[PDB]
């Protein structure tokens, strides 16, 4: 038995950056078919193709009992009425929980069961969200500034994007009459 070396890394709570982490960038062009308003999506991709979110991940070999962590910086914006959000996923191993820690900004988490039953959890700095086993989860930025959070998750959880990519979430988070509303997705399969 060799032992893995313990380590510390600095996370800047204001920027979300973790030095030496695997950085990933999701631009709007990378999210075709995720937003309700396809015409608003095409127009925004043409004009700007803005970054929707960036992820800084510190990941281990996929093995039972080990833990990954990542920050996400979710930028503010709307595609039509719909606030910017992360793609969303179930874990590849469904029976894996996750803990989120909100660091900066205003947002929330949309969760749904495999049957499409939905839950909205508000997130402000200091909110810790527990994502239980079997729940798909997507984060949403509802404010004017970046929404930054840290996720800690089992190293073997994986990501299943496919199911969400096709069917989506049963709820959408929109601005309507200057109010943030969590409403039925008109294009929800079921």
Ligand X SMILES: O=C(CO)[C@@H](O)[C@H](O)[C@H](O)COP(=O)(O)O
Q: Give CA–CA dist 134/151, Å, rounded.
A: 17
Q: Is 67 in the site for a copy of itself (CB under 8 A)?
A: yes
DSSP state of 85: B
Residue pair 109/120 in contact (Cβ under 8 Å)? The answer is yes
Residue 91 is labelled as binding a ligand? yes
Q: Which of residues 61-100 bind ligand X (CB under 6 A)?
A: 70, 72, 86-89, 98
Nearer of residues 7 and 179 to a copy of itself, judged by Cβ: 7
To ligand X, the closest distance from the beta carbon of 150 in angstroms equals: 9
- Decide whether 11 or 39 has the Cβ nearer to ligand X: 11
80/158 Cα distance (integer angstroms) = 31
Task: Write the binding mask 28 to 57 for ligand X: x where contact by CB under 6 A, - elsewhere.
Answer: ---------------------------x--
From Mn ion, ligand X, a copy of itself, none, which one binds at residue 67 (CB under 5 to 8 Å depending on kind)?
a copy of itself
Say how many CA atoms lie within 13 Å of 81 toward its Cβ: 15
To the question of whether residue 159 is assigned a binding role by annotation, the answer is no
Residue 16 main-chain phi, psi, to 5 deg? 80, -5
Residue 25 touches which member of Mn ion, a copy of itself, ligand X, none, C-beta under 5-8 Å by kind: none
Which of 156, 108, 163, 154 is CA-nearest to residue 136? 163
């Amino acid at each position: 038995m060799m032992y893995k070396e313990p380590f510390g890394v600095k996370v800047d709570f204001e920027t979300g950056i973790i030095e030496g982490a695997k950085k990933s960038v999701r631009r709007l062009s990378d999210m075709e078919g995720y937003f309700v308003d396809e015409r608003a999506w095409k127009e925004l991709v043409e004009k700007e193709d803005p970054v929707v979110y960036e992820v800084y991940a510190v990941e281990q070999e996929e093995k039972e009992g080990d833990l990954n962590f990542a920050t996400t910086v979710l930028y503010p914006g709307k595609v039509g009425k719909e606030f910017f959000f992360t793609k969303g996923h179930f874990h590849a191993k469904l029976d894996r929980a996750e803990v989120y820690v909100a660091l900066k900004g205003k947002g929330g988490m949309l969760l749904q069961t495999p049957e499409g039953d939905a839950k909205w959890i508000s997130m402000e700095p200091g909110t810790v969200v527990y994502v239980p086993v079997y729940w798909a989860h997507r984060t949403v930025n509802i404010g004017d500034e970046p929404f930054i959070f840290l996720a800690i998750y089992p190293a073997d959880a994986g990501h299943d994007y496919g199911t969400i990519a096709e069917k989506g979430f049963s709820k959408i988070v929109i601005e309507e009459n200057g109010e943030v509303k969590v409403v039925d997705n008109p294009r929800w399969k079921k």
